[PDB]
Write a protein that binds this DNA or RNA. Structure first.
Lengths: 206, 114, 98, 96, 83, 79, 127
RNA sequence: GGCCGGGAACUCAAAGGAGACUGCCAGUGAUAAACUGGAGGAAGGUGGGGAUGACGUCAAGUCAUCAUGGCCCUUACGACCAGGGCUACACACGUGCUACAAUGGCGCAUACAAAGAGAAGCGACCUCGCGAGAGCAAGCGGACCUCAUAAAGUGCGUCGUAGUCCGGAUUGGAGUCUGCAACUCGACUCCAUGAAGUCGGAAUCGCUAGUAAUCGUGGAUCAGAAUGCCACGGUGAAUACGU
RNA sequence: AGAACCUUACCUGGUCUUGACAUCCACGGAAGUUUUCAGAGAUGAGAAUGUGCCUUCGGGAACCGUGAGACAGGUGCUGCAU
């Protein structure tokens, strides 16, 4: 490889942790494994809910999983029954009386995960990716983000040869550690090969 | 002047020199000297009869390297000559603990030999 | 003598947390010793970066365990219960001790 | 790292719990330094797949036996994805 | 270009013309041993970075396996022969 | 050898040998416990123990006091 | 009456208290001859007090902990200086020209990934 | 005995700031960039070391970490179990460690580290114990106890070139712990071996400061199993005419 | 970044074929606990206790064994398909 992951290197910088609990070595592995258990059956059950982040935190023997979604209505449901049923699936797969908080993700096409997911959604629907990848390229420009990069990976179009194309616009100073780079990836399970997508969102300095 | 026949030190200390026995080493060749009140600064040929004889009675009870590694022999023979796997290791220059014999078998198997 | 030991992963949560006890507890019956900063234990992990042969990479990680020893000194009837209802700073080990 | 290989860890962890806490914690005291018995020690022989030595200690994500880390419970490859994506609290890049 | 390293003068006498000598007869970071080597040889005998360095290195470099009581005092003899 | 007490044998022959020690000498009995040590009572017994390919009988002689049976069950047989 | 200067060098951390008269030096409740002296760590601690008027007019009190023999000796040397510029400012320039004022920042290199001694790459003799 | 009052000075601990900016001065340089030195300054010229790797380069590697397209076997290369493999040598070469010793080795008194870990855990004292150690069992989920006496270093004596007091392979008796179980194929020790190795061929590798070079320390993985890896410290060098 | 079994993907032998591992259909028995006997174990042949929460009376709530099927399973092969 060549590149560092922009989000994790800024973990001690403007990018905040999306898993904030303090636990000892004894429960650290169990809590971390419990985090993956609650997360794996939280994104899978909300694959069409525009989930941006799933932040986990354990104040006192009860985790409070807040979900960043651009469409809270599908996650909340009618009068919060969907959060309620998801809550008791988290509550018994995490061992704690968990509760699920919800947060609207304003300006959805400006989220790294959502852009990666949105492109991935309309990528296996048998459409040409040149226009599809520009849609995230174009949409971000009118709504700020004075810097962005949307890279796609191998098996671009029905072919036996892998390709790569990224089509930068704006400025993406990934070397600058206070760049506040929103970055996330996704992969598309197409009938041929696997196509991974990678997007960087430069939401201004600090 | 034969503590055990072979394996005699010469012109050195009491304890460290008398590790020259090849049936007793650093730890069990100092008590035998200490059993008669020996000085640590005596040269090997500088002792007297009083110390030599007081040890010959108490050292002849043990074995000699000439006898030790060949009283090891029948232990390797009376017990270890059969198809025993450790005795299989005792056959063609082969390590007995089983350490990597691919390389690093340059004492029993010995030199480089295709 | 009510030993208070806080523990977090960043100081920007423990510092807000440690100040909370030094303020909330110190109302009428607290002569709080102070937000005493103890040496922060930091442990490191050298995970092998590549999924395969490539070995020389060996990225390095670090987790820091900041701790304070606020340690209010009179166990006032208020303090022995005033310290109880506060449970903010979600990820923080607040170990109340005598 | 197989569903067949993974299934024998659950078979072994769930079975090593009982005889260790019911027989080994009681019988291995006799075989220790208590000053052993020929016929009595035969009871330890009868069960096989209940021992701490039966450990593989595989990863908790993909069942990979190699490159484990007991603090996280995962393997070399999974901790990189599970940490630097931000999903492990307090863990950042170590530079000094 | 850059100049050669500046070394503090030998503390024992406060003179710069002895520290460079004791640093090269030194071996394996054992300066403490070095005074046991040369001070016993010195306190009891009673461009400037090219030829002085090279010539004086030749003095030190012949005391490895000469086979005697101790080259610690043999080098004292060697410098006594040199002086 | 380091056990210094109760020289172990796996179950694979206590279910056969230690059940019919006094019956006599028979055809070698199937055994998967070469990780073992011979008790003196097995004089003259032939116990077929699995080296990995087949079950190799063991001829218990009195050269042994605490030596092993897999000591007499070689597996890396070359040439 | 005590004039204090800390001094510290290479993980060492000294505390030097200067008093007037009797020119005696006490390090870790011990004299410097038994604790540092007669190696190159005897003259080195007194280099600053000897270039300036000799010790007999300055009583010392030193409590140094951590580091090593040389690191503490350098730390104490720095400790005496900081104490004695607080004593008098007339000898401000004399020590800096002599060079005891500055505090050494040459730490030991951290051991790093891929190198055998963090600056000695592993042998790659043959290709 | 910081041991206790007590002091909050100081080290230290962890939070925040200030400080270094060719800032100033002299000179060179087009006056400039820039450079040369000096001053102050703790730090001088991005003060030091890390993290950070551009488009792309090798159809580089991984289908065996995982995911995955296609392909393949579905009373089966599927699966369980026991066993034994995986460590087998007759070698060719890396990478090392051990070293090959008289800046020394052995014996005694013997001071000064940092950094880490500890709950089926670090496990102290005491006793037994030649020891692997064993029995009892305080404390510690820890700036509170243990790991852990750091060696190197210092003082004295000694070993006097002896393939040796070095060196430890190899091999034996017994152990000591872990586990159903160690011989295959664990470690280490008590005792006992005690050889090969006295610097090695062209060649080549690393290194410009706390750096090479030593010596110890801890940690990961780990029932048990470091000459390997990672991290910590101590002692601590010499050189640079230039392309 | 750590091979006595397991480990380990290899093999010898024994064994199971909706399978050790997942879900679905049906039949039973609660599971669990104490057991023995043959085998090396996987298992098989038996012997005791239990039969627990609803029981809205079925059966669920769990699990185990069995029955046919879908299916499972693969450290199987292409890293020049990714």
């Amino acid at each position: 490889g060549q590149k560092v992951h922009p989000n994790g290197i800024r973990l001690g910088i403007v990018k905040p942790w999306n898993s904030t609990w303090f636990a000892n070595t004894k429960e650290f592995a169990d809590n971390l494994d419990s985090d993956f258990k609650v997360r794996q059956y939280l994104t899978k059950e909300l694959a069409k809910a525009s989930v941006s982040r799933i932040v986990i935190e354990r104040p006192a023997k009860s985790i409070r999983v807040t979900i960043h979604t651009a469409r809270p209505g599908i996650v909340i449901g009618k009068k919060g029954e969907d959060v309620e049923k998801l809550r008791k699936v988290v509550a018994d797969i995490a061992g704690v009386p968990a509760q699920i908080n919800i947060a609207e993700v304003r300006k959805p096409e400006l989220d790294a995960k959502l852009v990666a997911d949105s492109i991935t959604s309309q990528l296996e629907r048998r459409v040409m990716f040149r226009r599809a990848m520009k849609r995230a390229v174009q949409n971000a420009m009118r709504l700020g983000a004075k810097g962005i990069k949307v890279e796609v990976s191998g098996r671009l179009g029905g072919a036996e040869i892998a390709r790569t194309e990224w089509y930068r616009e704006g400025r993406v100073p990934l070397h600058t550690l206070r760049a506040d780079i929103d970055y996330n990836t996704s992969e598309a399970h197409t009938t041929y090969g696997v196509i991974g997508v990678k997007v960087w969102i430069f939401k201004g300095e600090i | 002047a034969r503590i055990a026949g072979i394996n005699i030190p010469d012109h050195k200390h009491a304890v460290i020199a008398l590790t020259s026995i090849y049936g007793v080493g650093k730890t069990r060749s100092k008590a035998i000297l200490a059993a008669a009140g020996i000085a640590e600064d005596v040269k090997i040929s500088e002792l007297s009869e009083g110390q030599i004889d007081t040890l010959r009675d108490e050292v002849a009870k043990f074995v000699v390297e000439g006898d030790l590694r060949r009283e090891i022999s029948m232990s390797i023979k009376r017990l270890m000559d059969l198809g025993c796997y450790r005795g299989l290791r005792h056959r063609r220059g082969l390590p007995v603990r089983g350490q990597r014999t691919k390389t690093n078998a340059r004492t029993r198997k010995g030199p480089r030999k295709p | 003598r009510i030993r208070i030991r806080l523990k977090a992963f960043d100081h920007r949560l423990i510092d807000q947390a440690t100040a909370e006890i030094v303020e909330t507890a110190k109302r009428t019956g607290a002569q709080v010793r102070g937000p005493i900063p103890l040496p922060t234990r930091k442990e490191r992990f050298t995970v092998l970066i590549s999924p395969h042969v490539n070995k020389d990479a060996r990225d390095q990680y670090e987790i820091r365990t900041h701790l304070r020893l606020v340690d209010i000194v009179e166990p006032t009837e208020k303090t022995v219960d005033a310290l109880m209802r506060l449970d903010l700073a979600a990820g923080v080990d607040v170990q109340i001790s005598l | 790292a197989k569903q067949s290989m993974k299934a024998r860890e659950v078979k072994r962890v769930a079975l090593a719990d009982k005889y260790f806490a019911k027989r080994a914690e009681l019988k291995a005291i006799i075989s220790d330094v208590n000053a052993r018995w020929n016929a009595v020690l035969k009871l330890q022989t009868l069960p096989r797949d209940s021992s701490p030595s039966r450990q593989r200690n595989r990863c908790r994500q993909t069942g990979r036996p190699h490159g484990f880390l007991r603090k996280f419970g995962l393997s070399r490859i999974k901790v990189r994805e599970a940490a630097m994506r931000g999903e492990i609290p307090g863990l950042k890049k170590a530079s000094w | 270009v850059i100049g050669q390293r500046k070394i503090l003068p030998d503390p024992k006498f406060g003179s710069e013309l002895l520290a460079k000598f004791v640093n090269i007869l030194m071996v394996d970071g054992k300066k403490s041993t070095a005074e046991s080597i040369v001070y016993s040889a010195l306190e009891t005998l009673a461009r400037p970075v090219r030829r002085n360095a090279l010539a004086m290195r030749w003095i030190v470099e012949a005391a490895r396996k000469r086979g005697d009581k101790s080259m610690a005092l043999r080098l004292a003899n060697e410098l006594s022969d040199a002086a | 050898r380091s056990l210094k007490k109760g020289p172990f044998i796996d179950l694979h022959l206590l279910k056969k040998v230690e059940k019919a020690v006094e019956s006599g000498d028979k055809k070698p009995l199937r055994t998967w416990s070469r990780r073992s040590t011979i008790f003196p009572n097995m004089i003259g017994l032939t116990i077929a123990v699995h080296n990995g390919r087949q079950h190799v009988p063991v001829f218990v002689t009195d050269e042994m006091v605490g030596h092993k049976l897999g000591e007499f069950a070689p597996t890396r047989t070359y040439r | 009456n005590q004039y204090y200067g800390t001094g510290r060098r290479k993980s060492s951390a000294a505390r030097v208290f200067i008093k007037p008269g009797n020119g005696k030096i006490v390090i870790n409740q011990r004299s410097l001859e038994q604790y540092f002296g007669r190696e190159t760590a005897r003259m080195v601690v007194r280099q600053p007090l000897e270039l300036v008027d000799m010790v007999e007019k300055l009583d010392l009190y030193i409590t140094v902990k951590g580091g090593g023999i040389s690191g503490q000796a350098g730390a104490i040397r720095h400790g005496i200086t900081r104490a004695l510029m607080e004593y008098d400012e007339s000898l401000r320039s004399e020590l800096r020209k002599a060079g005891f004022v500055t505090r050494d920042a040459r730490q030991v290199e951290r051991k790093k990934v891929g190198l055998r001694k963090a600056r000695r790459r592993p042998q790659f003799s043959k290709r």
